[PDB]
């Protein structure tokens, strides 16, 4: 009763060693590399490889190979073969061309509804609009390149779909298909892929992940061609509709072909050359943005980088394939050196595609994930990092002293800035007399008056404990869905038994009897679930006692996923704790961890391999400061104290080491490829924030040594250094020469100091610039932003980013991904049409091919379409599908992107937005005017819809705990369910059987805790769901709920404690039932009898959509008043005008740009961020470093509760029990730590996770600078109607609407309007005054919730901790 659902997209990596093992066993020789993997695979092959080799088709192919008839090639040869396939003539051609014509026509017809709605609301007004009629005339003949990529993708996806379906139906199914892709024969499992080309007499062996990568390549190229065709047709109709980039697609297809030829000529090694082309595109960008010296230096460096990569690729290929079965596969164009002609032509095609255009050049970053992924040799990457991590570094003691002193100076300075005093010094007698004055005055000198001698003096400072370690572990930070490394003694369980020697197998079977079930887990989740002796103070005791030091169980496991490193559970705990302590205590002191001329330059360094150069002597001189600040020892120094004593092993399944007989300890196994010891620290990812703040300290030290200002910004593996220095210009020296000279000297100094602390910068990682802002992978020149938005939507396809192929999550992912063509690409129509192409594919074409729900979802959607045709009196099922694909997913429709999302990003009421979207969409059929007041005209279709929306059978169940979990929930089965609600009972049933008594006891009391949590706040007669969320987040049930919600997103929840990758049939049935109910929801929301023939149809005369939304939300919960949730929809409330009325009386958005177009331009105004008005709160004066972060978060939550619910009849008892239960203090003691809120309206100002903090527009930030808004004429109207009374209309969204509206009107009319005037509908705006809450909180139920889920309560503020608070 267990099925296996394989991947439809490349999620993992393509394995070099899996491919090598399979192909070496199949062809009985070294396939890709002469290493131990091929030998062990030929000596003792896996059962799944033996199954592939023993097939009849495989036996015949091996017979042909051993006779010399077919030639063995590398998977990149066949990638180039596949991406060229166009064999079959006129039959697949007519079929594919007809399918693509149909998809494009249907996508334009579905987009017509929204385009009509938008043009009718803006006042600009099967296909009704003229624009899309012209577009349908333009797009009725798909070009040959698009047809080519679509046909290839369709064939590969058909092969994959057939395999996945028959693999669900049958375990062990091997697909053998030589008819789908004509000419190729595929032999596909999850354990291997054998592709054989007959007329070329070529055969290759590869993996399932490589077939997934090939299908992803074909999909990515189809998506590039599709987006570019849509955009080019849109720009032919209107230069403002499409994207700002314009691509020739024959040049793009030639690019694809030439990259494929580079990957076929150079084998797997050719991805070096492919990767070095980002530098070429950046050089083409800098030839436009930069000045002669900077651009020339970058161009020469880039050419050297590309040719060095190509020479290294050639050498490595020739050295790898020399003693393998691929020795005769290297072309003569490699040794001829005539590969440089191919590379030249590829680069020339890239320069032609860029077209000397920043838009094309920034968009061309999709080329880097359009050619696939390389097979990464795991042992070889191990060996590459070994030489860097075993090298002895030589330091001047003064360099280490200055680095430690700069770190200590930044600590002192940030501590004085944030806490108004120096840190507590335990040896303050070491400061001469000049620093004693700073210490006693609680000040510090600036970096200018600072001296290197000062840093050397500060390096001698030691500290007392300022911050405290949490005593109880945060289970949210320590639990995840990744894998855990086994102990050192159980490290051989990471390889197949066939690949391990017999003595290793006997030793494993004997050693499993000496470890617990947590130490034999292989997963983090089950590592913690199986711990029958788990204690919440175990990590704290391990850190205090240094139980991680000299631990025999320590090992570092490396996996091909850039060599993702793993270690056992204890040490992973320690690593996560050190990183969390840094992130939450120290990163506040390092805010960049997120004359006649002043020279300026920019230096960009790659910090990806910065960790490998770090030793104890350089990182722990600062980790010791962090240890002293936390009263602990070696917690932040744990890496360079423990890792040098362990063994670094490559633990990929098909990359085992050679274990000499009689040797069974990993620390005794001979050092070899993929196995070495004495790793002198620098594991990637671990201790990353420490090394970031050390880089910031070194940058301050460099700024002090070079006497120039530095504005650093270290974002992950890339730091940007803005350097400024006031110079005096020499005789005839230009500003550019001065900037370049500053850049050169600063580069010399940066190199010198990094080499002082042991890091050898290389010319390929670092480049100097002057003005070009290239940070966070975004091109930004002269204030204008240049997006790479086609790169974000390369993987848009049917079953994307979903669990068990969930239909709804797939639609939502398609919409969310395709929305970046409008948010970044600044094209509403291109985003819309692309999204509709792929949504139509998903719904109409791929829904009948579900791997687990074979065609039940399609029959359900056909039922829904017939119901919609009967309800809305539509012509056929095509009109019904067009309507379904435009109805909101809240009501059961298939539209993931509501219309408000095109004008502002956030909203405080999803129900009003869904109703407004439905009104705007149904105006396409009812011919209602969106510029008029709602009217009854002749058509009761919108009347019927609204009647069905407000009329339903009330059926509330657990309303308060549901409004706690989701303050915007509906109830009475009026909305679609999500997987966390459907799966949570299964999660708790599974957790109740866990050996860990924390999870077990929290899951056994889960139903009763929910029943009590529903009773706590059930008699507070005005219902405030956001205050309910604040109550819910202050209780320990919230952490349990987060753990359960994390677990419920897993595949096969029931098989979590079963040690299997299979999926239980009960999980499949649960997901199937959920999908079917979610699909057919729109039948139950829109009954054919309208649910009321006694109550007549609703009258839309003087109808408020917001009053209707409030009524729906209250009736669905059978409550009387729900406050602080319903808010008007600004897209609906605002009437759009372009001429000044009698008196303005609206929001006036004006264009300050002088041109009639503002896309790609910047204006004088400040960017619009959103940034809702914040609270007014008085912070009490106390020592906050004495409290942990969770304790201060709990204090903030309890202060918000004292603010919102200050008027309940039980407030003293409520707050007393909350303070005793969650903080351990009495209410009179805890209240002295509460921020006191000066804002009267908590319905406006309350800050919850369930409320948006910012309200941005659906427009890039650079573009908001072109427009000026004026909310003065609307203020007088709002104050003459609601004088000094608060109302529920959001201001930030009202300006976001106007800005995005200016942008959209420019898109649709090819001219930006001079002004736009938003006139509000006053009947949609209501008062939002904070209520007077009546009723008593159930104190018994509150304390029973606290007592049942006590295992997740935070640390209590001690007496020892409370006395230190006010010293």
Partner 1 sequence: NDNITARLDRIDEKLSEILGMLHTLVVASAGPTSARDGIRDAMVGLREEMIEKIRTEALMTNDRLEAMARLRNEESEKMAKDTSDEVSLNPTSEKLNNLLEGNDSDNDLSLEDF
Instruction: Looking at residues 441 to 470 of the shown chain, list those that interact with partner 1 (rule: CB under 8 A).
Output: 453, 456-460, 462, 464-465, 469
Report CA torsion sign: 1018, 1021, 1025, 1029.
negative
Residues in the chain: 1367
Q: Rounded to an integer, what is the distance from CA 291 to the centroid of its chain?
A: 36
DSSP assignment of 1100-1129, as one string? Answer: -TT--HHHHHHHHHHHHHT-S-B-S-----
Is 998 in contact with 1338 (CB distance < 8 Å)? Answer: no
Scanning 431-439, 684-692, 708-716, 1116-1124 for contacts with partner 1 by CB under 8 A, the matching segment is 431-439
Interaction mask 603-622, partner 1, x per CB under 8 A? ------------xxxx-xx-
Nearer to partner 1, 616 or 1111 (CB): 616
Tokens (6 digits) for 771:
């003005």
Phi, psi dihedrals of residue 352, rounded to the nearest 5°: -70, -40
Radius of gyration of the chain (CA): 33
Residue 310 binds to partner 1 (criterion: CB under 8 A)? yes
Nearer to partner 1, 385 or 747 (CB): 747
Candidates 66, 169, 762, 1232: give the one binding partner 1 (CB under 8 A): 762
Subset of 79-108 contacting partner 1 (CB under 8 A): none
Q: Measured between alpha carbons, how far is 787 from 1157 in angstroms, rounded to an integer?
A: 18
Is 496 in contact with 533 (CB distance < 8 Å)? Answer: no
Scanning 671-679, 709-717, 1116-1124, 1329-1337 for contacts with partner 1 by CB under 8 A, the matching segment is 671-679
Least spacing, CB of residue 307 vs partner 1, in Å: 4
Subset of 464-503 contacting partner 1 (CB under 8 A): 464-465, 469
Angle at 473 between CA 470 and CA 477, to 5 degrees: 110
Residue 347 binds to partner 1 (criterion: CB under 8 A)? yes
Residue 938 binds to partner 1 (criterion: CB under 8 A)? no
Is 275 in contact with 308 (CB distance < 8 Å)? Answer: no
Nearer to partner 1, 17 or 459 (CB): 459
Tokens (6 digits) for 770:
């002057």
CA contacts within 13 A on the Cβ side of 757:
31
Least spacing, CB of residue 1251 vs partner 1, in Å: 39
Nearer to partner 1, 545 or 1102 (CB): 545
Interaction mask 234-273, partner 1, x per CB under 8 A? -----------------------xx--x--xx--------
Candidates 447, 641, 663, 1011: give the one binding partner 1 (CB under 8 A): 641
Is 711 in contact with 598 (CB distance < 8 Å)? Answer: no
Least spacing, CB of residue 1075 vs partner 1, in Å: 47
Neighbours of 433 (CB within 10 A): 6
Candidates 584, 966, 1213, 1364: give the one binding partner 1 (CB under 8 A): 1364
Residue 1360: partners with Cβ closer than 8 Å, 6 or more residues away: none
Least spacing, CB of residue 606 vs partner 1, in Å: 14
Is 159 in contact with 180 (CB distance < 8 Å)? Answer: yes
Subset of 1303-1332 contacting partner 1 (CB under 8 A): none
Is 580 in contact with 721 (CB distance < 8 Å)? Answer: no
Subset of 1173-1192 contacting partner 1 (CB under 8 A): none
Q: Measured between alpha carbons, how far is 223 from 838 in angstroms, rounded to an integer?
A: 10
Report CA torsion sign: 49, 50, 51, 57.
positive
Is 666 in contact with 506 (CB distance < 8 Å)? Answer: no
Nearer to partner 1, 276 or 1306 (CB): 276
Candidates 514, 748, 933, 1176: give the one binding partner 1 (CB under 8 A): 748
Nearer to partner 1, 387 or 1179 (CB): 387
Subset of 269-298 contacting partner 1 (CB under 8 A): 296-297
Q: Measured between alpha carbons, how far is 1004 from 645 in angstroms, rounded to an integer?
A: 43
Candidates 483, 555, 632, 648: give the one binding partner 1 (CB under 8 A): 632
Does 735 participate in catalysis according to the annotation? no
Candidates 42, 49, 114, 640: give the one binding partner 1 (CB under 8 A): 640
Least spacing, CB of residue 287 vs partner 1, in Å: 12
CA contacts within 13 A on the Cβ side of 185:
13
Residue 35 binds to partner 1 (criterion: CB under 8 A)? no
Q: Measured between alpha carbons, how far is 53 from 889 in angstroms, rounded to an integer?
A: 48
Nearer to partner 1, 715 or 737 (CB): 737
Candidates 756, 967, 1224, 1354: give the one binding partner 1 (CB under 8 A): 756
Lookup result for tokens 């086609």: 790
Subset of 317-336 contacting partner 1 (CB under 8 A): 331
Subset of 539-558 contacting partner 1 (CB under 8 A): 543-545, 549-550
Least spacing, CB of residue 552 vs partner 1, in Å: 13
Scanning 529-537, 625-633, 923-931, 1047-1055 for contacts with partner 1 by CB under 8 A, the matching segment is 625-633
Tokens (6 digits) for 143:
């070009």
Residue 307 binds to partner 1 (criterion: CB under 8 A)? yes
Candidates 172, 432, 591, 660: give the one binding partner 1 (CB under 8 A): 432
Subset of 122-181 contacting partner 1 (CB under 8 A): none
β-sheet bridge partners, residue 176: 187
Subset of 679-708 contacting partner 1 (CB under 8 A): 680
Least spacing, CB of residue 191 vs partner 1, in Å: 31
Tokens (6 digits) for 276:
């070095």
Subset of 1094-1123 contacting partner 1 (CB under 8 A): none
Residue 645 binds to partner 1 (criterion: CB under 8 A)? yes
Least spacing, CB of residue 421 vs partner 1, in Å: 16
Scanning 100-108, 384-392, 497-505, 1103-1111 for contacts with partner 1 by CB under 8 A, the matching segment is 384-392
Nearer to partner 1, 348 or 1276 (CB): 348
Selecting among 867, 928, 1244, 1326, the annotated active-site residue is 1244
CA distances from 51 to 56, 58, 66, 756, 816 (A): 10, 10, 19, 57, 42
- Through-space distance between the first and last CA atoms of the chain, rounded to whole angstroms: 64
Subset of 386-415 contacting partner 1 (CB under 8 A): 387, 390-398, 400-401, 404-405
Least spacing, CB of residue 555 vs partner 1, in Å: 16
- For residue 676, give the 3-state DSSP assignment: strand
Angle at 797 between CA 792 and CA 803, to 5 degrees: 100
HEC profile of 174-230:
CEEECCCCCCEEEEECCCCEEEEECCCCEEEEECHHHHHHHHHHHHHHHHHHHHHHH
Give the binding-site size for partner 1 (rule: CB under 8 A). Answer: 103
Candidates 1, 47, 433, 513: give the one binding partner 1 (CB under 8 A): 433
Least spacing, CB of residue 558 vs partner 1, in Å: 19
Residue 717 marked ligand-binding: yes
Tokens (6 digits) for 1308:
């649709």
- For residue 473, give the 3-state DSSP assignment: coil
Neighbours of 664 (CB within 10 A): 19
Q: Measured between alpha carbons, how far is 369 from 274 in angstroms, rounded to an integer?
A: 10
Residue 669 binds to partner 1 (criterion: CB under 8 A)? no
Least spacing, CB of residue 365 vs partner 1, in Å: 20
Residues 872-890, buried b or exposed e (16+ Cβ, 10 A)?
Answer: bebeeebbbbbbbbbbbbb
Nearer to partner 1, 544 or 1011 (CB): 544
Residue 739 marked ligand-binding: no
Nearer to partner 1, 50 or 396 (CB): 396
In 3D space, the residue among 934, 938, 939, 932 whose CA is nearest the CA of residue 915 turns out to be: 934
- Binding-site entries for Mg(2+): 606, 717
- Binding-site entries: 606, 717
**Hey, which residues are catalytic here?**
1244
């Amino acid at each position: 009763a267990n099925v296996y659902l394989t991947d439809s997209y490349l999620k993992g990596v393509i394995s070099f060693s899996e491919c090598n093992a399979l192909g070496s066993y199949i062809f009985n020789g070294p396939y890709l590399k002469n290493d131990y993997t091929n030998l062990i695979s030929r000596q003792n092959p896996l059962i799944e490889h033996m199954n592939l080799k023993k097939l009849n088709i495989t036996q015949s192919l091996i017979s042909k190979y051993h006779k010399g008839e077919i030639k063995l090639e590398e998977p990149t040869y066949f990638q180039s073969l596949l991406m060229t396939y166009k064999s079959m003539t006129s039959s697949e051609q007519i079929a594919t061309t007809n399918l693509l014509k149909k998809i494009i026509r249907r996508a334009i017809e579905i987009s017509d509804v929204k385009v009509y709605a938008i043009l009718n609301k803006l006042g600009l007004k099967t296909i009704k609009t003229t624009l899309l009629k012209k577009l349908m005339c333009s797009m009725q003949h798909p070009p040959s390149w698009l047809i080519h990529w679509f046909n290839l993708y369709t064939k590969l996806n058909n092969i994959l779909t057939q395999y996945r379906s028959n693999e669900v139906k049958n375990h062990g199914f091997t697909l053998i298909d030589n008819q789908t892709l004509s000419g190729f024969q595929f032999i596909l499992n999850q354990y291997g892929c054998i592709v054989y080309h007959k007329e070329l007499k070529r055969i290759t062996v590869t993996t399932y992940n490589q077939f997934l990568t090939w299908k992803d390549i074909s999909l990515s190229r189809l998506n590039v061609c599709l987006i570019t065709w849509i955009s080019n047709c849109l720009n032919t109709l209107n230069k403002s509709l499409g994207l700002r980039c314009g691509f020739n697609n024959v040049i793009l297809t030639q690019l694809f072909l030439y990259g494929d030829c580079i990957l076929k000529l150079f084998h797997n090694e050719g991805f070096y050359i492919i990767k070095e082309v980002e530098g070429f595109i950046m050089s083409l960008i800098l030839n436009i943005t930069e000045e002669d010296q900077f651009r020339k230096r970058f161009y020469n460096s880039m050419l050297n980088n590309i040719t060095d990569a190509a020479n290294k690729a050639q050498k490595n290929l020739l050295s790898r394939v020399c003693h393998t079965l691929l020795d005769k596969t290297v072309s003569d164009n490699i040794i001829n050196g005539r590969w440089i002609i191919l590379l030249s032509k590829f680069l020339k095609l890239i320069k032609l595609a860029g077209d000397n255009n920043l838009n094309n050049l920034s968009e061309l970053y999709f080329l880097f994930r359009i050619f696939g992924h390389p097979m990464v040799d795991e042992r070889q990457a191990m060996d590459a990092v070994k030489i860097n991590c075993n090298e002895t570094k030589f330091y001047l003691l003064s360099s280490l002293s200055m680095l430690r002193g700069a770190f200590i100076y930044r600590i002192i300075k940030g501590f004085v800035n944030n806490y108004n005093r120096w840190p507590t010094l335990r040896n303050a007698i070491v400061l001469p007399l000049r620093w004693l004055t700073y210490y006693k005055l609680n000040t510090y000198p600036s970096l200018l008056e600072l001296t290197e001698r000062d840093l050397i003096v500060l390096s001698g400072l030691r500290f007392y404990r300022e911050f405290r370690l949490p005593k109880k572990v945060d289970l949210e930070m320590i639990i995840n869905d990744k894998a855990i490394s086994p102990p050192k003694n159980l490290i051989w369980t990471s390889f197949p038994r066939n690949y391990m020697p017999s003595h290793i197998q006997n030793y494993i079977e004997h050693e499993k009897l000496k470890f617990s079930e947590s130490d034999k887990s292989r997963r983090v989740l089950e590592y913690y679930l199986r711990d029958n002796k788990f204690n919440e103070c175990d990590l704290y005791n391990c850190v205090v006692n240094q139980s991680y030091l000299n631990n025999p169980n320590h090992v570092v496991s490396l996996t091909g996923k850039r060599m993702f490193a793993m270690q056992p559970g204890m040490f992973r705990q320690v690593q996560i704790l050190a990183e969390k302590m840094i992130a939450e205590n120290i990163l506040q002191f390092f805010p960049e961890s997120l004359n006649n001329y002043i020279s300026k330059c920019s230096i960009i360094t790659d910090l990806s391999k910065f960790n490998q150069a770090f030793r104890y002597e350089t990182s722990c001189i600062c980790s010791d400061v962090l240890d002293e600040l936390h009263g602990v020892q070696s917690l932040f120094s744990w890496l360079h104290l423990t890792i040098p004593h362990v063994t670094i092993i490559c633990t990929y399944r098909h990359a085992p080491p050679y274990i000499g007989d009689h040797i069974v300890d990993l620390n005794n196994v001979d050092e070899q490829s993929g196995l070495y010891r004495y790793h002198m620290g620098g594991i990637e990812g671990w201790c990353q924030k420490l090394w970031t703040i050390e880089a910031i300290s070194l940058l301050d030290l460099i700024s002090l040594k070079g006497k120039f200002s530095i504005t650093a910004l270290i974002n992950g593996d890339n730091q940007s250094i803005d350097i400024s220095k006031p110079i005096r210009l020499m005789e005839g020296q230009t500003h550019a020469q001065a900037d370049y000279l500053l850049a050169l000297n600063s580069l010399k100094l940066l190199y010198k100091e990094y080499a002082g602390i042991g890091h050898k910068l290389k010319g390929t990682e670092t480049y100097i610039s002057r003005d070009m802002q290239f940070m966070s992978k975004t091109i930004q020149h002269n204030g204008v932003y240049y997006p790479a938005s086609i790169k974000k939507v390369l993987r848009v396809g049917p079953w994307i980013n979903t669990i068990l192929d969930d239909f709804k999550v797939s639609l939502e992912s398609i919409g969310s991904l395709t929305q970046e063509l409008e948010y970044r690409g600044e094209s509403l129509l291109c985003s819309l049409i692309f999204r509709n192409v792929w949504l139509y594919n998903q719904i109409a074409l791929q829904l009948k091919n579900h791997a687990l729900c074979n065609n039940k979802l399609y029959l359900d959607i056909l039922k829904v379409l017939k119901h919609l045709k009967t309800f809305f009196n539509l012509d056929n099922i095509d009109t019904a599908l067009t309507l379904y694909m435009n109805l909101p997913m809240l009501f059961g429709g298939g539209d993931p992107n509501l219309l408000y999302r095109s004008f502002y990003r956030r909203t405080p009421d999803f129900l009003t937005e869904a109703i407004v979207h439905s009104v705007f969409i149904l105006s396409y059929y009812t011919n209602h005017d969106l510029k008029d007041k709602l009217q009854d005209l002749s058509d009761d279709r919108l009347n019927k819809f609204l009647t069905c929306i407000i009329t339903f059978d009330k059926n509330p169940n657990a309303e308060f705990v549901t409004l706690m979990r989701d303050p915007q929930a509906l109830g009475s089965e009026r909305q679609a369910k999500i997987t966390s609600e459907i799966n949570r009972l299964a999660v708790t049933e599974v957790l109740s059987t866990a050996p860990n008594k924390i999870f077990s006891k929290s899951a056994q009391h889960y139903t009763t805790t929910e029943i009590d949590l529903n009773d706590i706040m059930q008699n507070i007669e005005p219902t405030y769901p956001h205050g309910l969320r604040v109550v819910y987040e202050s209780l320990p049930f919230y952490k349990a709920e987060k753990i359960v919600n994390l677990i419920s997103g897993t595949k096969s929840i029931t098989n979590i404690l079963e040690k299997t990758s299979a999926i239980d049939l009960t999980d499949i049935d649960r997901a199937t039932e959920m999908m079917r109910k979610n699909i057919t929801l729109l039948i139950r929301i829109l009954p054919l009898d309208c649910n009321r023939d006694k109550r007549e149809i609703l009258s839309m005369e003087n109808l408020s959509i917001t009053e209707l939304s409030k009524y729906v939300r209250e009736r669905s919960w059978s409550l009387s008043n729900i406050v602080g949730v319903t808010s008007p929809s600004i897209m609906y409330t605002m009437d759009i005008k372009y001429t000044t009325s009698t008196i303005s009386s609206g929001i006036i958005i004006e264009k300050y740009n002088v041109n009639s177009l503002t896309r790609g331009e910047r204006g004088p105004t400040k960017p619009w961020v959103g940034s809702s008005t914040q609270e007014k709160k008085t912070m009490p004066v106390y020592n906050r470093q004495v409290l942990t972060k969770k304790q201060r978060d709990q204090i903030d939550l309890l202060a918000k509760l004292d603010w919102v619910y200050a008027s309940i009849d039980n407030k003293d008892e409520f707050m007393e029990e909350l303070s005793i239960g969650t903080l351990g203090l009495t209410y009179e003691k805890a209240k002295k730590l509460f921020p006191q809120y000066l804002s009267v309206n908590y319905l406006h100002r309350l800050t919850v996770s369930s409320r948006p903090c910012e309200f941005p527009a659906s427009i890039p930030a650079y573009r908001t600078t072109n427009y000026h808004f004026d909310t003065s004429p609307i203020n007088r109207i709002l104050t003459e109607k609601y004088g000094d009374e608060d109302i529920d209309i959001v201001f930030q969204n009202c300006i976001s609407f106007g800005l995005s509206l200016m942008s959209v009107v420019e898109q649709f009319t090819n001219v930006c309007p001079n002004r736009i005037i938003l006139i509000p509908k006053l009947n949609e705006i209501h008062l939002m005054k904070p209520p007077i809450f009546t009723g008593d909180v159930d104190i018994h139920k509150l304390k029973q919730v606290i007592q049942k889920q006590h295992m997740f309560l935070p640390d209590k503020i001690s007496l020892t901790q409370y006395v230190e608070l006010f010293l």
